[PDB]
Amino acid sequence: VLTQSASVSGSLGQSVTISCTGPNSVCCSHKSISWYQWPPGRAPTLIIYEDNERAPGISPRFSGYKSYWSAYLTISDLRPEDETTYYCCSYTHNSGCVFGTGTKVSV
Amino acid sequence: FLGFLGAAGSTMGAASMTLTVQARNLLSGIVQQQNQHLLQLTVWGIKQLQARILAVERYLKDQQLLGIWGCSGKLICCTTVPWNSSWSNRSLNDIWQNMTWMEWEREIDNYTGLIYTLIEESQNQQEKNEQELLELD
Ligand SMILES: *[C@@H]1O[C@H](CO)[C@@H](O[C@@H]2O[C@H](CO)[C@@H](O)[C@H](O)[C@H]2NC(C)=O)[C@H](O)[C@H]1NC(C)=O
Ligand SMILES: *[C@@H]1O[C@H](CO)[C@@H](O)[C@H](O)[C@H]1NC(C)=O
Ligand SMILES: *[C@@H]1O[C@H](CO)[C@@H](O)[C@H](O)[C@H]1NC(C)=O
């Protein structure tokens, strides 16, 4: 039920943005949102969690922003490695993760 | 009484919510006589008295450090010294919720003396001077 932008593109060194919205029942404003850089075959790497700060070791290039209707993941200073699939997740402290449809970033 | 070291090995927050138990159980008053044999062998009492003196001395050393840091009456006190990233690079959540005070003490054990000198010199010795220069008029 959590819908992202199917695809998004950004030039080299630019700042791209991935949307992440869903239904009223599963609202971004109600819960917290985490983002994942997930190459499909490889093990996924946590990049954003709790809608604030970042995962440990993540460069300051990744940034997040949660509106009351949709979430946005911003990746400044785009790199060739950033051409992977990104997934958002809605959750509480006791309810499991709800992944989105996914977004493929082109550079 | 009870609950001593109840939060050992837990998150640093759970430990920093119950410092009063450790504080009251640091200094154990003499267990009074249940009931004749108050006079005892000299050799036997020598160990117990030395242990009590060492305990009292360690407590007064900690209280002396408190006094020269300006935190005599409180168990928790914030200071003016900024954290230098040299000693630790991990953030707040990586410390207070993920780690315990044990591994944390070992990580900062090398720098604990360096922080102590800073806590004693950088802030309080300037604070008292600025207080005298401020209330001088
Ligand atoms: C240490 O003890 C704590 C509990 O005192 C354990 O972590 C908690 O486990 C319960 C039970 O699943 C959860 O409801 C809490 O949310 C947990 N707390 C945290 C901060 O995660 C923990 O598993 C124990 N082990 C270690 C190594 O810390
Ligand atoms: C932090 O540590 C470095 C290296 O020891 C030192 O050069 C610097 O002055 C320190 N900064 C502070 C504020 O103590
Ligand atoms: C502390 O110093 C010793 C050397 O005396 C060193 O081997 C150790 O890695 C140091 N640990 C930290 C956390 O600085």
Side-chain angles (χ1 to χ4, degrees), chain B residues 77-127:
Chain B
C77 71
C78 296
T79 60
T80 85
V81 170
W83 187 265
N84 207 2
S85 300
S86 337
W87 321 321
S88 127
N89 281 286
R90 303 139 172 165
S91 72
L92 201 137
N93 288 341
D94 314 327
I95 285 168
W96 291 99
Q97 313 155 348
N98 230 4
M99 294 168 56
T100 87
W101 278 97
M102 206 161 244
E103 10 156 355
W104 177 243
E105 185 56 65
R106 302 159 189 234
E107 219 257 285
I108 326 286
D109 249 317
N110 295 356
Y111 324 102
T112 220
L114 311 171
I115 311 177
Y116 291 169
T117 58
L118 265 60
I119 295 182
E120 218 284 303
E121 167 181 46
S122 300
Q123 55 175 18
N124 269 49
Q125 194 47 30
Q126 218 81 345
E127 293 190 21

Side-chain angles (χ1 to χ4, degrees), chain B residues 49-95:
Chain B
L49 296 169
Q50 186 174 354
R52 305 218 307 259
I53 292 311
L54 183 60
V56 158
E57 271 191 325
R58 282 173 50 85
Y59 168 79
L60 279 198
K61 177 194 67 63
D62 286 345
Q63 292 289 334
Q64 168 91 348
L65 290 191
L66 263 58
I68 51 183
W69 299 344
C71 302
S72 71
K74 293 182 293 297
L75 294 154
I76 327 287
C77 71
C78 296
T79 60
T80 85
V81 170
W83 187 265
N84 207 2
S85 300
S86 337
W87 321 321
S88 127
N89 281 286
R90 303 139 172 165
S91 72
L92 201 137
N93 288 341
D94 314 327
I95 285 168

Side-chain angles (χ1 to χ4, degrees), chain A residues 10-13 16 36-40 42 45 47 58-59 61-62 75-86 103-107:
Chain A
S11 77
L12 198 81
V16 77
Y36 287 87
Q37 173 181 108
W38 194 342
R42 294 181 183 174
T45 299
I47 47 182
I58 295 301
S59 308
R61 304 185 295 102
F62 295 84
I75 316 164
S76 305
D77 204 3
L78 273 153
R79 307 294 177 91
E81 49 255 46
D82 295 346
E83 185 179 1
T84 53
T85 58
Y86 294 82
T103 293
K104 314 189 193 309
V105 172
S106 297
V107 177

